[PDB]
Amino acid sequence: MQGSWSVLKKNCSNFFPGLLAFAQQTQEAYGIWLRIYNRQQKYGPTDFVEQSETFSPDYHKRFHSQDKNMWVDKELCTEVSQKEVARLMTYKLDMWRMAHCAGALLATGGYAIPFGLFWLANDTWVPSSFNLTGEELRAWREAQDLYRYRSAPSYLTDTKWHFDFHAYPWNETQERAWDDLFEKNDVRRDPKVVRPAAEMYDGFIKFELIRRKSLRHLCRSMNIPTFPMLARLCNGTRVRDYWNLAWCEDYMVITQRLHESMTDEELYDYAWRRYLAPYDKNLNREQLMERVEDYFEFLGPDFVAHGKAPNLVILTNYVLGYYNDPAYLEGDISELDKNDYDHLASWGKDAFLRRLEFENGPLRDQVEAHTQRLLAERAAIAK
Amino acid sequence: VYTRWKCDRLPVFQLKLFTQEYPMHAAVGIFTIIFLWKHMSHCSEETERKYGWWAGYPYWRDPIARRNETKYKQMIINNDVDITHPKWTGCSVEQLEELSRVV
Amino acid sequence: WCPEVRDRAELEVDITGWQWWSPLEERRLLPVRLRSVNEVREIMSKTQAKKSA
Amino acid sequence: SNPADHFRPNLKALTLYAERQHYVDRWLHVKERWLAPWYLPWWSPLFQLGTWYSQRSRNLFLVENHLSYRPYKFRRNDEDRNNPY
Amino acid sequence: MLLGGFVPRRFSQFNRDPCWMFFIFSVGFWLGEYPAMMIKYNARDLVYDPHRYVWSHHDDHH
Amino acid sequence: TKYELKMQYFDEWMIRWRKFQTESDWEIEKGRQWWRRFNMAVSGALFCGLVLYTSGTATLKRQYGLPHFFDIGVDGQAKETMLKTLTSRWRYTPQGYGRVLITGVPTYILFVTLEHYRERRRMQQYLQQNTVFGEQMRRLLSTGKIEEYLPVNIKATLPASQQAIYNY
Amino acid sequence: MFLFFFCDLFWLRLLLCMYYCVWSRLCFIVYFNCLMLIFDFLLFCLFDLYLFVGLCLFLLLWFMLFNLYSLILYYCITYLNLYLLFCIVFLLYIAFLFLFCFLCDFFLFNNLLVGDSFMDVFFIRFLLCFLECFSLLCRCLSTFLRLFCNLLSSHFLLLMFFDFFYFIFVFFFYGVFCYWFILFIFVFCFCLLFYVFLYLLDLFAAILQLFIFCNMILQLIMDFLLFLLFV
Amino acid sequence: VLFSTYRSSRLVSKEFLHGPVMRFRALGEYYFQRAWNGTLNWALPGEYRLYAVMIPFIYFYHRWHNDHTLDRDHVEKAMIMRWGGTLEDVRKLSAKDQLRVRCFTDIEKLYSAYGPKDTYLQPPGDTLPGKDFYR
Amino acid sequence: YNMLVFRDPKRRPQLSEEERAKVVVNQAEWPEEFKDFDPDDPYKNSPEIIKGMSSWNLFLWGVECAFIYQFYELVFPKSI
Amino acid sequence: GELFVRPKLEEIPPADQCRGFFGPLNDSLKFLRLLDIKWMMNRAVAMRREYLIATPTLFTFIWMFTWKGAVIYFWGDRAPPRRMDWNTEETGRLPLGFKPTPAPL
Ligand SMILES: CCCCCCCCCCCCCCCCCC(=O)OC[C@H](COP(=O)([O-])OCC(O)COP(=O)([O-])OC[C@@H](COC(=O)CCCCCCCCCCCCCCCCC)OC(=O)CCCCCCCCCCCCCCCCC)OC(=O)CCCCCCCCCCCCCCCCC
Ligand SMILES: CCCCCCCCCCCCCCCCCC(=O)OC[C@H](COP(=O)([O-])OCC(O)COP(=O)([O-])OC[C@@H](COC(=O)CCCCCCCCCCCCCCCCC)OC(=O)CCCCCCCCCCCCCCCCC)OC(=O)CCCCCCCCCCCCCCCCC
Ligand SMILES: CCCCCCCCCCCCCCCCCC(=O)OC[C@H](COP(=O)([O-])OCC(O)COP(=O)([O-])OC[C@@H](COC(=O)CCCCCCCCCCCCCCCCC)OC(=O)CCCCCCCCCCCCCCCCC)OC(=O)CCCCCCCCCCCCCCCCC
Ligand SMILES: CCCCCCCCCCCCCCCCCC(=O)OC[C@H](COP(=O)([O-])OCC(O)COP(=O)([O-])OC[C@@H](COC(=O)CCCCCCCCCCCCCCCCC)OC(=O)CCCCCCCCCCCCCCCCC)OC(=O)CCCCCCCCCCCCCCCCC
Ligand SMILES: CCCCCCCCCCCCCCCCCC(=O)OC[C@H](COP(=O)([O-])OCC(O)COP(=O)([O-])OC[C@@H](COC(=O)CCCCCCCCCCCCCCCCC)OC(=O)CCCCCCCCCCCCCCCCC)OC(=O)CCCCCCCCCCCCCCCCC
Ligand SMILES: CCCCCCCCCCCCCCCCCC(=O)OC[C@H](COP(=O)([O-])OCC[N+](C)(C)C)OC(=O)CCCCCCCCCCCCCCCCC
Ligand SMILES: CCCCCCCC/C=C/CCCCCCCC(=O)OC[C@H](COP(=O)(O)OCCN)OC(=O)CCCCCCC/C=C/CCCCCCCC
Ligand SMILES: CCCCCCCCCCCCO[C@@H]1O[C@H](CO)[C@@H](O[C@H]2O[C@H](CO)[C@@H](O)[C@H](O)[C@H]2O)[C@H](O)[C@H]1O
């Protein structure tokens, strides 16, 4: 979304109340995260707590491993509720953006003020706390959805093009899953058909081998600030933490069937944090429930059985596929009755163009026959 | 759909290209530019006479001397420099007057 | 008036996908064609047998 | 000689001269003007980036104690190998 | 890449396309400048500069 | 206070008029260089310590575990001692931006503070000098401008074989 | 010293603006190997091996606008300087080298230590590693030197031959009207043949040298690429 | 907020200077947008007429520049050095004398290294002025 | 054919001999520009761009331009 | 060329098997392993840690080809002359009777 004066006024008016609300949310989220971190350190697996090293097979660069460095706390409901987890995730996003802004301010002293003016003129990178009314929150959500639309297609195309150019599926079912994975949101994708793509891509690329450019595109699509990007293991850590929290909340909801009892707005927010339900689509409860059930089905029974989610890259592609709107087409079909090269009519045809028209026109067969006969006669005379 | 080359304006695309596509090359280019302007940005008068002119240095008018004369006149006039000061001449003003009367 | 092709090409190029040939995808999709009536009959018979069993 | 002269740029338009001292001093004045305001603390990375490397280079130059002679960078004649002055 | 275009079969056809007309004009200039130089620089009345030994590029570049 | 903005002009002038550099000023600059090196060393030690403290447990086990390159016996003893010391207590082992900040911000702050205060110390030292450089520094801090050709204006000391210019 | 000058491409820039205001396909490329690095299917690389395509294409365009058009008399190669070419090659080569080094994967350099464990480490393998580390920089220097010298020599030869041809054509054409016309005709035919041969040789050599210039960079890149197999 | 980062933010109407732009595009497209106009890395087209038209024009303007701007300097230097060493001394001559001198310079250029050396080497016993004539 | 390095393109035949033999040629429908069409000289009857302007006339025009360029100073010399 | 896999802990030969310039530096000579460069090279090769030999070399070359080369060329100290112009330590001191300006206060 582009900046505007109205949004600038809105953010300037709500700047200090927004900061105060952000501080209160910071205290609350610090408490929640302290609880979660204590539980992880106490009951977490040895590899997860010790931060086991997983190196790539080509350049031996360490990155988070989905199996080892990600752990689902099935018993987190005792200490932390679902709403607390959602609050923590939202605060994590807001805190990331605020931390980047504060780092810029500290680095550049008082020279960041005009850049701050640019920042407050757009809702893309402002915290949710700056919105004090429903309309402001709706506009902020619209800006976030616009950024997601802007970013996701690049990530999807990167993944699909790299895989298709450097590899092909093994069997027909994998082919169908791969083809249906990257369909536009206007059609409904069956998670059962699409799931094998996860194993296929695990064969191709895991979350531990994700490239830095693809990571940048993903972070753009997740409304995660990317500047300064730095090494790939920082925003990678952010992504891992966010999706670990999301998986814990998803396990809690699936086990306790909270989504059925979840209200309409809370359900919409829950889907939105999973990048499943844009607000501009004006989805009803039926569609939200369908998408959430499809997401749970894609996670698969193994998620509940052992807390193991499918490949994170494929999961991100699948969820972001809802932001891959059909390519725009505006204009009545009658426009196809016009002509594009009328301005050349005055130039006419030169000798070469006339020759080409004569040779390849409706008389082409006659000219070909005459030419071939003449050439044959000349060749016979030569011999 | 959004694409950097088609949607962004030229300056924005330039910054993106040289910051997230070819940043190391830009850094090396800046390093080399700094080196060139720090060590290869001087030309002595003799070097200019030898190679600095297309057909050769026109000694019959010595434009370098005129250029330096204009430079020094401008500096003296603007900065209000007393070229008769003993440090410039190595002798007192009275000695300078004595020399002028002598020669 | 063929927006899907435009978007895919532009996105592929903007993500460093300069190459214009996709032998693997073509190999996967080259032999695709609408089936003949007899082939449809055979497929329907197979489906009916599967459903019955 | 003449064939060698054909490998020169053919669109030279203007040449400008400036002493190292003068433009270095002007650059220092600009840097001081932009780094002077109170809203840029001395501990900011920008200020250190501006000042520390220059200070280090100048200190290295001052500390230098070389047994050989380095001819003036901006002499009138530097083409004579047997006349460093 | 030299793939196609109008190609006159002989000289008389160079007037069948404006581009080749300009080309033949240029060729005429090119080839006719040489006889002009022959006539001008081998003329009977052409005289070497008396002061030619006063200065030369050979002493300048030396 | 921003001493670098004042001191840059003085340093440039000294480089331009380095001939009048007394041995005292040379010693001052050598001490400044030595203190810069010391600050670099201490900042690097702090950075290494912070990195080691925040290192992951598995990373520490791999680094300070078998095999031993030399296998002398002292190497293994030292590695085991360090590994036990690090793994005994609980350590905050962040990753990503957090580790970057923790390891860098303290180091940058320390290095910058030490360098700034050493620059102030050098300014004081040059103020206390009784040479032409000290006089130039005092005049710069008084009038705010650098007075070039000062050594010849006040007739600073010259070698016995070069005093003819002052003969006026 | 600040010299203000202009490149000799303004007319070519005008032509590019005129003829490329609308899209056109490209199917012939001087260095096509920058697009097809992998030939065995199921091999893929996590490194940005296709980052060099844009620079390769732009360099080819720039050097072709300069060198190929330099065959036209009085056309100027504005960039024809040894140290300028050194700066260009330094930029490209060192940028890619620092991209590989910033990866902070020391094992990537294991192949520098040539030979096997059988060879003496200190007296054979270490010397070979030294020589190869030197050879990288020598490859950079050789690339830039070759590019400079080819053009310099070709244009020197062209200028000298053209001067000789002008001299004989102007000051000895009258022999056509004389009894020794046959010798002049033979010499003129030989000169025409030589003119054509030199122009063809230079045309081919310019493109070939651009190909080699890009291939050296691509070889640098390939020397440190590792391909994973799909499963 | 001050300036847009998107090219979609138009500064003019779609019909601004439509006609001249269409004429310019017609000029561009007629010969270039053809199947046989296959470029080699965008620099070498496939249309013969493009070569036939562009090579002569390039040569013509380059030669005009070289003759009226570059070699003129050498010609003037020769005239000045050989006829007094000052511009006024040359201007003291008539136009015909200057023409003679410049044509002799052209002769020297044409001879280059493949011609008699008496044009710049004074044979012993020659009565013509030497190098110290004006000194 | 060729004019220096420029070679005249030739259309590849598309019809087989059997089909070709069954083709009836009617030059009455052909344009006047291309009648008795010859692959070795397809532009023999092509109209001139300018009526009465021959190739030799343009060649002579260029030669005259060269002569002017080389001889104008001889008749109207100018001082330095 | 091909992918590199680090050796397992059990695949690494013992230190005693490594050879130095003259011979193995076994018991009573272990502390000499630190000083023997060839022994360290052989140990690194045996442990597949060849980069310790290659990385320092290449980087060094780069450092010379990039930053130190020009520094030496432009600012390096050449060989001293036979007759040396030592400093008399007479320049710089203020003249007698000069009244230096007061220090800041
Ligand atoms: C005055 C000197 C200045 C020096 C120059 C500085 C120049 C600017 C550089 C940037 C400096 C920092 C800017 C503020 C950031 C805000 C604080 C913060 O870390 O936020 C958390 C957050 C952590 O991100 P993450 O990815 O979630 O962390 C992953 C970890 O696993 C997270 O671990 P976890 O998963 O276990 O979760 C833990 C989480 C759990 O907690 C929570 O969830 C609760 C919330 C906690 C965080 C709250 C942050 C709030 C931010 C907004 C503040 C208000 C802004 C208001 C603005 C308007 C004001 C009018 O709690 C944390 O966030 C703790 C993180 C670790 C602490 C990092 C701080 C270390 C430095 C401070 C100590 C310095 C001591 C000096 C001693 C000197 C001795 C001599 O910070 C960021 O978003 C990262 C920074 C983004 C910008 C990066 C820019 C480049 C930086 C390069 C630095 C290189 C070294 C320095 C030299 C530079 C030379 C070029
Ligand atoms: C046709 C001609 C047209 C005109 C052309 C003009 C001529 C241009 C010629 C040359 C152009 C190419 C130059 C390339 C250079 C090499 C670049 C390179 O190697 O980059 C590697 C690498 C590439 O970056 P990346 O993170 O991988 O991704 C870059 C993408 O663009 C990230 O993209 P993304 O999509 O992933 O993320 C998008 C979004 C994502 O959203 C976010 O990230 C959220 C918002 C983040 C806000 C910023 C957070 C910063 C946190 C602290 C960073 C560390 C600070 C270190 C300490 C301070 C050092 C100064 O981020 C943003 O929207 C960033 C907004 C930044 C706006 C400022 C851009 C510059 C405009 C000019 C202003 C300055 C003018 C000075 C000169 C004039 C003075 C009178 O750079 C970095 O790692 C970034 C380090 C940044 C350090 C701070 C800046 C240092 C430079 C000096 C600053 C001086 C300030 C002076 C202030 C005023 C004094 C009076
Ligand atoms: C990650 C990157 C990967 C990609 C790489 C891509 C590039 C390719 C790689 C190759 C590089 C290409 C070059 C590109 C251009 C870059 C710029 C450039 O060349 O600038 C050079 C440029 C050269 O200077 P210059 O301008 O030519 O002027 C020359 C003057 O010397 C300047 O004067 P100054 O006042 O600035 O002083 C400079 C000073 C710099 O040094 C210092 O200031 C002092 C030392 C600083 C130490 C820093 C911290 C180190 C760690 C501390 C301890 C940690 C552990 C703590 C716990 C311990 C527990 C027990 O050096 C000296 O002057 C020499 C002093 C040496 C004293 C030796 C005394 C004798 C006893 C000690 C040695 C012998 C021990 C024998 C033991 C035997 C036992 C059996 O700048 C410098 O080198 C100096 C300034 C920067 C200093 C940075 C210091 C940190 C360096 C990194 C250390 C850590 C990483 C390395 C190890 C990694 C292991 C995994
Ligand atoms: C205006 C400000 C100007 C600032 C200038 C200073 C530089 C820029 C400042 C910072 C800018 C912001 C961005 C920095 C890069 C961020 C990278 C990143 O994303 O890291 C994420 C990463 C977090 O990810 P993680 O998953 O938690 O852990 C990484 C994984 O382990 C990763 O796992 P892995 O599988 O990748 O494991 C490999 C990993 C393992 O490494 C690590 O990640 C561990 C952390 C680094 C350890 C480094 C120390 C190693 C030991 C050194 C021993 C030295 C002994 C010397 C003794 C000398 C005795 C005389 O990487 C390595 O192996 C690399 C080792 C380093 C090799 C160094 C080679 C240097 C060659 C030098 C050539 C010659 C130079 C010239 C000549 C000099 C001599 C004359 O961060 C870190 O691990 C540490 C980040 C530290 C950031 C830099 C802090 C800067 C502090 C500056 C203080 C001084 C300021 C001075 C100001 C002056 C006035 C203006
Ligand atoms: C003191 C005497 C004066 C001089 C002062 C100089 C001060 C110097 C300060 C110290 C600098 C130190 C460092 C110097 C390093 C130099 C290195 C160097 O030369 O490298 C060669 C290198 C050669 O590059 P290149 O490959 O030839 O390509 C560069 C070209 O510019 C072509 O590249 P491109 O085509 O890719 O560029 C993009 C191009 C894209 O293409 C275009 O846009 C096409 C147009 C191209 C224009 C540029 C080409 C210029 C051609 C020659 C001049 C044209 C005629 C001028 C007539 C002057 C008559 C006296 O677009 C533009 O150029 C944008 C500008 C368009 C302007 C349009 C203006 C329209 C006005 C309409 C008004 C209507 C009023 C109606 C009123 C009605 C009332 C009723 O030069 C550069 O790269 C640029 C060097 C510039 C360095 C900065 C200099 C400082 C700025 C000085 C500005 C002075 C303005 C005041 C002048 C007033 C008249 C006297
Ligand atoms: C007729 C004679 C002909 C002679 C011909 C000789 C060959 C000339 C070839 C020229 C063309 C080819 C050029 C190739 C490129 C060469 C590059 C080169 O050598 O450059 C070296 C030079 C070295 O610079 P320097 O010469 O100013 O070195 C300073 C050293 N002292 C102070 C001791 C004198 O690089 C530069 O000039 C650029 C310097 C600025 C950019 C880098 C800044 C960061 C430095 C980091 C380390 C130090 C600071 C601490 C860390 C950072 C903290 C923030
Ligand atoms: C931000 C200014 C705050 C203070 C108020 C200054 C008002 C000065 C008087 C201005 C009168 C003329 C205004 C004409 C309309 C300007 C429209 C404009 O700014 O558009 C920018 C437009 C580019 O737009 P795009 O990026 O393509 O897309 C825009 C949509 N996002 O820029 C232009 O075309 C240039 C227009 C320049 C107009 C003049 C601006 C003058 C500003 C001066 C500010 C300094 C204070 C002046 C005080 C004056 C007191 C009498
Ligand atoms: C957080 C750390 C805070 C540290 C605060 C201060 C701690 C107490 C003082 C530390 C010791 C200082 O003592 C320091 O000794 C060295 C010599 O060894 C002196 O250095 C002197 O001799 C060395 C000898 O090589 C010369 O290179 C140097 O040019 C010269 O100045 C320093 O001028 C002096 O300051």
Pairing of strands I6-7, I2-3: antiparallel
In eight-state DSSP terms, residue A109 is G
CA dihedral A237, A243, A244, A249 (to 10 degrees): 150
Phi, psi of G43 (to 5 degrees): -95, 130
Residues paired with residue I74 on neighbouring β-strands, in sequence order: none
G5 sits in which H/E element: strand G2-5
Rg (CA), chain I: 23
Q: Please work out whether the CB of residue G7 comes within 6 Å of at least one atom of ligand 5.
A: yes
Coil/strand/helix, residue D59: helix
Say how far apart CA A23 and CA A26 lie, in whole Å: 5
CA atoms within 13 A on the CB side of G157: 13
DSSP secondary structure of B12-64: HHHHHIIIIISHHHHHHHHHHHHHHHHHS----HHHHHHHSSSS---TTT-HH
CA dihedral F67, F70, F73, F75 (to 10 degrees): -80
Say how far apart CA F66 and CA E29 lie, in whole Å: 86
Query: Cis ω on the peptide bond leading into residue F67 (within 30° of 0)?
Result: yes
Neighbouring residues of A177: CB distance < 8 A, sequence distance ≥ 6: A169, A193, A194, A195, A196, A197, A200
Chains touching chain D through at least 3 C-beta pairs below 8 angstroms are: A, B, E, F, G, H, J
Say how far apart CA F58 and CA F83 lie, in whole Å: 11
A302 sits in which H/E element: helix A301-306
Say how far apart CA F24 and CA F21 lie, in whole Å: 8
Contact A370, A361 (CB under 8 A): no
State the residue for tokens 């190029």.
C13
Q: Please work out whether the CB of residue A203 comes within 6 Å of at least one atom of ligand 2.
A: no
Q: Is A137 exposed, middle or buried (0-12, 13-18, 19+ CB in 10 A)?
A: middle
Say how far apart CA H34 and CA A356 lie, in whole Å: 12
Say how far apart CA J14 and CA G73 lie, in whole Å: 73
Q: Helices (H), strands (E): how many in chain A?
A: 18, 0
* Distance (Å) of CA H21 to CA H8, H26, H28: 20, 8, 10
Give G152 to chain D, closest Cα distance, Å: 8
Length of chain F: 168
Q: Helices (H), strands (E): how many in chain G?
A: 5, 3
Deposited resolution, Å: 3.7
Which ligand has the minimum distance to the alpha carbon of residue F113? 1
Q: Is A22 exposed, middle or buried (0-12, 13-18, 19+ CB in 10 A)?
A: middle
Contact H110, E38 (CB under 8 A): no
Contact E32, I62 (CB under 8 A): yes
Q: Does G92 touch chain B (CB under 8 A)?
A: yes
Coil/strand/helix, residue G43: strand
H101 sits in which H/E element: helix H95-111
Q: Which of H54, F61, F30, C17 is CA-nearest to residue A161?
A: C17
Neighbouring residues of F36: CB distance < 8 A, sequence distance ≥ 6: D56, D59, F115, F118
- Residue J51: closest C-alpha in chain G: G110
Chain G interface with J: residues with Cβ < 8 Å: 94, 97, 101, 106-107, 109-113, 117, 121-122, 125-126, 129-130, 133-134, 136-137, 226, 228
- Residue F19: closest C-alpha in chain D: D62
Q: Which of B7, D58, F99 is CA-nearest to residue A236?
A: F99
Q: Does H65 touch chain B (CB under 8 A)?
A: no
CA H48, chain centre distance (Å): 25
Say how far apart CA H94 and CA H77 lie, in whole Å: 17
Q: Which residues of G touch H69 (CB under 8 A)?
A: none
Say how far apart CA H27 and CA H53 lie, in whole Å: 14
Give B66 to chain J, closest Cα distance, Å: 32
Residues paired with residue G28 on neighbouring β-strands, in sequence order: H40
**C-alpha J43 – ligand 4 centre gap (Å):** 27
Contact H58, G11 (CB under 8 A): yes
Say how far apart CA A45 and CA A74 lie, in whole Å: 13
- Residue H24: closest C-alpha in chain G: G18
